[PDB]
Amino acid sequence: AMEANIFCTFDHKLSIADVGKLTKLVAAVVPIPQRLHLIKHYQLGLHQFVDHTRGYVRLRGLLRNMTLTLMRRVEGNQILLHVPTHGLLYTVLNTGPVTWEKGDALCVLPPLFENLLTLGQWELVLPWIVPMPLALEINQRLLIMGLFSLDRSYEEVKAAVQQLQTITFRDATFTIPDPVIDQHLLIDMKTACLSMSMVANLASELTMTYVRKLALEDSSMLLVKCQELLMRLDRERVSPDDEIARLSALFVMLRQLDDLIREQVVFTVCDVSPDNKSATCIFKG
Amino acid sequence: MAAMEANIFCTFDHKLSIADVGKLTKLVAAVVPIPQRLHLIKHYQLGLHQFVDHTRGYVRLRGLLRNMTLTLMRRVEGNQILLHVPTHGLLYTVLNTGPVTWEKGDALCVLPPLFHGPLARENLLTLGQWELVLPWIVPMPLALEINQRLLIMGLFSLDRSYEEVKAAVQQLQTITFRDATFTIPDPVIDQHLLIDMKTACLSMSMVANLASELTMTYVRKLALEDSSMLLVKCQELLMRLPARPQHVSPDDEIARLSALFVMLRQLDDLIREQVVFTVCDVSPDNKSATCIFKG
Amino acid sequence: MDARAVAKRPRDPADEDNELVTALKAKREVNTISVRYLYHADHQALTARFFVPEGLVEFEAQPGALLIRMETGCDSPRHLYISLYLLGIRASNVSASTRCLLESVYTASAARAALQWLDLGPHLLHRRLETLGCVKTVSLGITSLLTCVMRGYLYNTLKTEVFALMIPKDMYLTWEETRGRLQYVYLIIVYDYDGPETRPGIYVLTSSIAHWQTLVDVARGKFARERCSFVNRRITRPRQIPLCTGVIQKLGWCLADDIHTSFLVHKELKLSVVRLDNFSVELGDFREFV
Amino acid sequence: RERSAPKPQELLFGPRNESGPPAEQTWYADVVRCVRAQVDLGVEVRAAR
Amino acid sequence: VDRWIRHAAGVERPQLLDTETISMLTFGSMSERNAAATVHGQKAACELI
After folding, report:
1. First to last CA, chain C
2. Interface contacts C/D by beta carbons within 8 Å
3. What does the alpha-carbon distance between residue B115 and residue B98 come to, in Å, rounded to a whole number?
4. DSSP H helical segments within chain A, as ranges?
5. Which residue of chain C comes nearest to A282, CA vs CA?
6. C5 CB-near residues (< 8 Å, 6+ apart)
7. What is the full DSSP assignment across A188-229?
8. How far lies B11's CA from each of B34, B38, B186, D45, in Å?
9. Highest taxon of the source (chain E)?
10. How far is CA B159 from CA A201, A214, B156, B192, in A?
11. Is the sign of the CA dihedral B10, B12, B16, B20 positive or negative?
């Protein structure tokens, strides 16, 4: 009795040793760009997406748009991928650098680092599977290091960047890559950081008028305390068309940051072997 | 005792003509909402027409539609229609009701219908001062822009005079999306939108307060020695008026920026609809697509 | 491919042989094992197995309860599996009599360590906890075995009887007077910021509302005092970073007619609970509202 | 009231947290009204923080 | 005085992560290293009263 499967044909020849190398990934996760039936090997993995100017957050967005798949037995001249369906359970290989415990929640992240088999113009790379708190921590730290990119010259910033760069978890102490190269920012990181800083900046000078107008009416009465908090912040430190453009800019800038704001809860885990590389989990949308 | 039905039959009781059942057959594989679930229901409860009222506030209709349940249409036959409730994660086929073009790989949302062009297509089973008004299935950017423009218009209604509000409303009433254009019907300001205004302004002031010195100063610092069209537009939007950073504290900074992250999420959820559908490859005529039901 | 094969009715696990039967038929061999009918073959519910110390098992000796995973940063066992009933001893939304009863019943050594770990860290309960659905068997000992469902209809092995889920009475909350035949049940945590401690409240909420925006609207409507407390602490005490006056998690769908009120007995002590028999578990993650 | 915070040892084993004082205090009060010159002198009242 | 006694006695000053480890240790943890070599079997614990 067959089931729904995706067929993949390696266009380049595969030696026996290469097939034996690949078979060790029996049940690893592999992303595919589109839900075809007979896909070519160039589409597998995240290699075709990597670029020299585009950054990590672009990979995160593309992976969110990506379709997640699971592997099946490799055999003569063909390899089979099984696309999961919600609320069934599956086996996954913990390619990530973090061990798992029962009841952990997992999400998929683009990679940051044996190596996997390569071809003449091709390499095979798979995304990370990480528990949600560490995913939040790593995204927060990488974004905040994007902020310090501008001030890097001073030694305080270098020490702070080094301290932020290290991450600690259950018996895991790896280091994440510095999001700056040659004292310059990759353009997607620049857009994300600028969007967050702008949506922070716009709210400081826009809210006061609308808040003070609404203060007359609130029966829930906390909006007046909000007004007082904004006035205390002020103590700490126009034509309608410009106003409407500014509101539109605020909301479009917020939507630009939505690429990083929400997390796909891909997997929840069932008990794991001492072979801990391998674990079982239930797929969630 | 009770059992939750999954197959729903709808029976008409008006003496339909041949053209009515003919137009019903055209509607196969569309999506229709129901307020309550039973094995056999009357046509009066099916469709969105039951909710329309003379005030015609669009925000009211959106809020009402959010609570409703969604179903698909299957096996249309004489005066008896079968509606199948979708199960989360399964693969379904759907025929789009509205004129909005779809694209593969994106997400879709449910919205009440819009004023488009001459307003020609209302032929949907107009009978006995009742009609089958279907909801629209539209891609994510158009729905987000609609919610954004309603909320922005509501905010602008305050602190402004009547004629300025009229000009702004007449501008915001329009939308452009993928070579198409649409107009929002009856976007009148109402107390339903006032609740959204209150929560959105509270969240916005919170994100203003939680922002740290470095986050605020980043844009102004970068304008010093960088230059691009994006940067010049962003600077033009902002008001116009090196040094070692005043304070450095990655721990306090990361806590602050996490709180600001939560506040930004809360502000964003105001305009994000429930992501009903994720789409697969679509027929090139744009009429029907294969999708997965989520949420 | 052929027309008859395409038109043929789908395969029937209902009467076709199980795999072991096929193999033993193939070799014509018989073991002493009653190999024909496999238990749990038709089970749709996804099951997990958990080990727990002996102290916590009380009130789980009666089948049906929420099983929660709590975190502890120590090198030695990083997670401890706790029950919703014990978690009430920390909430400020429990009457004095019920809290005293729970404090008396759970006085085993292991339980108090979990209570220390819950409030010995700076972080609130929201970041510390995660939900595992409903527990349905006991096997007692110095270490006891629990089995638990994470996407399920809640039943005994032979499905001879449905297993209910019990919620303590003080935590149970309703926001509508009339109930539609379908309604969802959620886990609710709210925080009081006016007191010196960040004092948490624990709630379980049944509602006919499935859409997040309207549910959060009603929640902010009812929890207005707690929201005002959050704003008050934010304005009053700078350099402090509070967050999320309340959090929501979705956990269940149930047919509203099923709800009953019942008493629960253990150690010949009597507890008051609310009961949902024909229950099912659907699990989402935590989410924040302000 | 003049007691050190219990060590983790005492909290883990033996007696439970020893009961503290209740918020509900008892007061006795006099109230005087000036609009009509008359006084009340033997009042008993509940108090809380 | 503690430094002198621990230095002369031959036992290292104990250090444990944060406060929460003391509750974990009280719950139970094996917390001293195995000896380099064992020609004889287990170190028979002597208690001195």
Report:
1. 59
2. 11
3. 11
4. 16-22, 56-65, 132-148, 155-165, 187-214, 222-236, 240-261
5. C46
6. none
7. HHHHHHHHHHHHHHHHHHHHHHHHHHHTTT-SS-HHHHHHHH
8. 14, 12, 32, 69
9. Viruses
10. 21, 9, 7, 19
11. negative
**DSSP 8-state assignment for residue C18:** P
Contact C116 D13 (CB under 8 A): no
Q: Do chains A and C touch (3 or more CB pairs under 8 A)?
A: yes
3-state secondary structure of A156: helix
| Per-residue buried b or exposed e for A125-148, using 16+ beta carbons within 10 Å of the residue's own CB | bbbbbbbbebbbbbbbbbbbbbbb
**What is the spatial distance between Cα C256 and Cα C278, in angstroms, rounded to a whole number?**
10
Nearest CA to B215 out of A257, C244, C233 is that of A257
Cα–Cα distances in Å, from C96 out to C92, C102, E35? 9, 10, 53
**Is B222 exposed, middle or buried, given 0-12, 13-18 or 19+ CB atoms closer than 10 A?**
buried
First-to-final CA distance of chain B: 27
- Report the sign of the C-alpha dihedral through residues B150, B151, B155, B156, in that order: negative
Q: State which H helix or E strand residue C215 sits in.
A: helix C212-222
Helix (H, G, I), strand (E, B) or coil at B295: coil
Q: What is the Cα Rg of chain C in Å? A: 23
Share of chain A residues as helix, strand and coil, in percent rounded to the nearest 5: 40, 20, 35
Whole-angstrom distance, CA of residue A136 vs CA of residue C243: 16
Residue C87: phi and psi, rounded to 5, are -60, -25
Q: How far apart are CA B132 and CA B109, in angstroms?
A: 20
Q: Which ranges of A149-186 would DSSP assign to H, the alpha helix?
A: 155-165
| Token code pair at residue B224 | 């010093």
Q: Radius of gyration (Cα) for chain E, nearest Å?
A: 15
Q: What share of chain B is helix, strand, coil (3-state, %, to 5)?
A: 40, 20, 40
Three-class DSSP category at B83:
strand
Strand C172-174 vs strand C199-207: parallel, antiparallel, or unpaired? Answer: parallel
Give CA–CA dist A96/B229, Å, rounded: 39
Subunit partners of chain A (3 or more CB pairs within 8 A)? B, C
Is residue C210 classed as helix, strand or coil in its secondary structure?
Answer: coil
Collapsed DSSP state (helix, strand, coil) of residue B235: helix
- Chain A CB contacts of B214 under 8 Å are 147-148
Structure tokens at B294: 């989520």
Please give the distance of CA A211 from its chain centroid, rounded to a whole number: 35
Q: How far apart are CA C178 and CA B275, in angstroms?
A: 28
Q: Which of residues 131-150 of A touch B (CB under 8 A)?
A: 136, 140-141, 143-144, 147-148, 150
For residue A130, give every residue at least 6 positions away whose Cβ sits within 8 Å of its Cβ, in sequence order, or none.
A96, A98, A106, A107, A108, A109, A138
